[PDB]
């Protein structure tokens, strides 16, 4: 190919967006920005599907030309702007607030929140560097950058951000007995508490988890975000609190256990 790709066929787009295969050959190619393309969704899919407020391209235009929609405290005017996980969306007229989370199935979903929960988000720490003029810096998963934060924050920790000031508020590390949320894998959207961590060299660390209704599951650190100072969670999670059931369990719970 002579240069950069512009289009995106409908069968190639992420299974997390959950778009119907048969209607048309194309899907919206996300603009470059905060999260990766595989870990985010364009804004126009949210307004037409996840939270229905438009039904046609003429309406999608009008909503943003009138400057109505705010993401992380700034007004947005690109219809193909990417939104990702733990990412406050709001309309200042009618004072609505939402976070973006995963269903138990791993699709995307908007969750309504109060104007308290709307003030902060969580991210993971990726690198630490010193910059010209001897200025310390720190960086995060979604392309965030921070000047003169607390030096003790370590790579791999997770940090809570105040959306109005754009400063770090709190820090939590990967240890036994803390709450975790699952970003990618077989168990997307599950929520649980750390049983035990097995350290590996030059390779990913393996983390073992207990679920709130008893189930053990393990995954690699690269798929986990840590979502509380010790015991209990920061953000409010969905109507169902992240318990996943097998078809087998759904049957037992529906028709009763197999008797002797």
């Amino acid at each position: 190919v002579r240069g950069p790709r512009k289009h995106l066929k409908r069968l190639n787009a992420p299974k997390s967006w959950s778009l119907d295969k048969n209607g048309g050959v194309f899907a919206p190619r996300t603009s470059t920005g905060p999260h990766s393309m595989q870990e985010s969704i364009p804004l126009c899919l949210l307004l037409t599907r996840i939270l229905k407020v438009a039904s046609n391209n003429k309406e999608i235009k009008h909503i943003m030309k009138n400057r109505l929609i705010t993401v992380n405290g700034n007004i947005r005017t690109d219809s193909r702007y990417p939104v990702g996980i733990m990412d406050v969306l709001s309309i200042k007229k009618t004072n609505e607030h939402y976070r973006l989370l995963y269903n138990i199935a791993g699709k995307f979903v908007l969750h309504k929140i109060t104007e308290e929960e709307a003030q902060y988000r969580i991210a993971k720490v990726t690198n630490k560097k010193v910059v010209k003029g001897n200025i310390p810096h720190t960086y995060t998963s979604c392309g965030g950058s921070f000047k003169y934060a607390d030096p003790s924050i370590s790579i791999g920790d997770s940090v809570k951000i105040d959306i109005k000031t754009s400063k770090i508020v709190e820090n939590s590390s990967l240890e036994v007995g803390k709450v975790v949320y699952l970003i990618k894998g077989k168990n997307i959207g599950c929520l649980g508490v750390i049983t035990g961590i097995e350290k590996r060299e030059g390779t990913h660390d393996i983390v073992n988890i207990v679920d709130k209704v008893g189930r053990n599951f393990s995954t690699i650190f690269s798929n986990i975000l840590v979502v509380g100072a010790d015991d209990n969670p920061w953000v409010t999670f969905t109507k169902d609190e992240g318990i996943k059931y097998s078809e087998y369990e759904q049957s037992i719970k529906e028709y009763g256990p197999m008797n002797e």
Partner: protein, 168 residues
């Protein structure tokens, strides 16, 4: 050409086998079906359920057995086809009932078809004039007409079927 849609019939390996010819001839005659394709279609349907029962009984694991047995038996009860007192949460009866499925016959699927139901409920003088009332819109279910003789009637729809007089 390769294109969308399944094929629902299997052609018999021997075109002029005398025991097959005679036994097919009888069943088309008695039930007032259009041609051999109607019959062969029902035969493939019947074979499919028999295969599932075979597979369940020979499976090694318990999770699949307990899960998929229930689904199979409930489905065939709703169609009004497999009529017996299956009890759930009891492994032996599930096995017993799976074995009773293995000698199910196409006659049982035929008798759920609307053309036969209409005649059997004494709303028509023959299996022929039953078909002729399903054409020409005289037959109605839940207050709506049904144009197609092959409509398979689930268990308990029998209360809502009706006939009306001709338009003339």
């Amino acid at each position: 050409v390769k294109s969308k849609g399944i094929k629902k019939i299997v052609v018999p390996h021997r075109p002029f086998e005398r025991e097959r010819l005679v036994s097919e001839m009888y069943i088309v005659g008695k039930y007032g079906l259009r041609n051999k394709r109607e019959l062969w279609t029902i035969q493939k349907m019947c074979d499919s359920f028999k295969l599932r029962a075979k597979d369940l009984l020979i499976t090694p694991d318990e999770k699949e057995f307990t899960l998929s047995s229930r689904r199979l038996l409930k489905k065939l009860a709703e169609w009004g086809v497999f009529m017996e007192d299956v009890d759930y949460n009891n492994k032996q009866s599930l096995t017993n009932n799976l074995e009773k499925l293995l000698d199910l016959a196409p006659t049982s699927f035929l008798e759920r078809r609307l053309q036969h139901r209409i005649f059997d409920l004494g709303l028509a003088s023959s299996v022929h004039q039953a078909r002729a009332f399903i054409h020409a819109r005289r037959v109605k279910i839940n207050g709506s007409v049904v144009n197609k003789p092959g409509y398979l009637v689930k268990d308990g729809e029998d209360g809502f079927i009706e006939v009306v007089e001709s338009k003339r």
